């Protein structure tokens, strides 16, 4: 069970695109959180391992995932950082929940088809 890079990209890139297509919900997630620009300096205290869609896309494009679960792990790290940091009434928190619902539905048949 060795996965070729283009096998992972062809299967998994569409699931990432489905997250980017969510508007407005993907908007806080398209680039790394920049705490200084956003006025949230406490972010680097609370979020030890940042992740976002641009980083995941670059890792798929450059062959940094060897197995599918490593990609799923990074998507879930992005979601967990956002639920950890943001208040339950906030846009980014509610938007994260939508992205998780979309991702759950996208990734399920994809994982089957990868073996
Ligand atoms: C994973 N993100 C976090 O953990 C963030 C925690 N604090 C934040 C404050 C602002 C933003 N950013 C980033 C830059 C783009 C952006 C765009 C929107 C947006 C939503 N809709 N529109 C029309 C624009 C929002 C907004 F949801 F707050 C937030 C943000 C992200 C976060
Ligand atoms: Na699709």
Curated annotation (Swiss-Prot):
Effect of residue 101 to R: Abolishes interaction with ASF1A
UniProt modification remark: Methylation of the KIX domain by CARM1 blocks association with CREB. This results in the blockade of CREB signaling, and in activation of apoptotic response.
Compartments where found: Cytoplasm; Nucleus
Signal sequence residues: none
Primary role: Acetylates histones, giving a specific tag for transcriptional activation. Mediates acetylation of histone H3 at 'Lys-18' and 'Lys-27' (H3K18ac and H3K27ac, respectively). Also acetylates non-histone proteins, like DDX21, FBL, IRF2, MAFG, NCOA3, POLR1E/PAF53 and FOXO1. Binds specifically to phosphorylated CREB and enhances its transcriptional activity toward cAMP-responsive genes. Acts as a coactivator of ALX1. Acts as a circadian transcriptional coactivator which enhances the activity of the circadian transcriptional activators: NPAS2-BMAL1 and CLOCK-BMAL1 heterodimers.
Disease implication from the record: Chromosomal aberrations involving CREBBP may be a cause of acute myeloid leukemias. Translocation t(8;16)(p11;p13) with KAT6A; translocation t(11;16)(q23;p13.3) with KMT2A/MLL1; translocation t(10;16)(q22;p13) with KAT6B. KAT6A-CREBBP may induce leukemia by inhibiting RUNX1-mediated transcription. Rubinstein-Taybi syndrome 1: A disorder characterized by craniofacial abnormalities, postnatal growth deficiency, broad thumbs, broad big toes, intellectual disability and a propensity for development of malignancies.
Domain notes from UniProt: The KIX domain mediates binding to HIV-1 Tat.
The protein's name: CREB-binding protein
Annotated source species: Homo sapiens
Residues of the whole record sequence present: 1083 to 1197 of 2442
